[PDB]
Design a protein around this ligand. Structure first.
Ligand SMILES: CCCCCC/C=C\CCCCCCCC(=O)O
Length: 133
């Protein structure tokens, strides 16, 4: 199920993150710092509650959720959203809704790497994470 996603992951590639942030209305100064930040993402489970931590030198976030149960979230860029995370096709799909807008954060495993695809508007960003021991 979710088990192969669990652990500590480090950013090792990023494509079109500025486009994604700009689509969300993130200001230039934040985008600038974010473009040079390499987060660590930690995914943990306790029974069927998942906790997803994102740690960096700039912004930190943490969310806890049950798969398939909506939760309130305040994102790194300070959007207050209604969220749900589900497994779909073996991918961990995180959908955020606010003001009639939506964005998806889709995680999948390819060759042992965690590929995060972020879509908002027409912007599609692909971030690659590798596992840490
Ligand atoms: C997490 C470090 C940079 C974040 C700075 C805030 C700017 C934009 C937030 C966009 C939504 C969250 C993106 C997460 C990207 C990721 O987990 O690699």
């Amino acid at each position: 199920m979710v088990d192969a996603f669990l652990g500590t992951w480090k950013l090792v590639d990023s494509k079109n993150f500025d486009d994604y942030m700009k689509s969300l209305g993130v200001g230039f100064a934040t985008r600038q710092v974010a473009s040079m930040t390499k987060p660590t993402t930690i995914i943990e489970k306790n029974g069927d509650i998942l906790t997803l931590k994102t740690h960096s030198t700039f912004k930190n976030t943490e969310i806890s959720f049950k798969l398939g149960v909506e939760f309130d979230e305040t994102t790194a860029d300070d959007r207050k959203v209604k969220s749900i995370v589900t497994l779909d096709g073996g991918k961990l799909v995180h959908l955020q809704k606010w003001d009639g807008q939506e964005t998806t954060l889709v995680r999948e495993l390819i060759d042992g790497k965690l590929i995060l695809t972020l879509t908002h508007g027409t912007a599609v960003c692909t971030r690659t994470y590798e596992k840490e021991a």
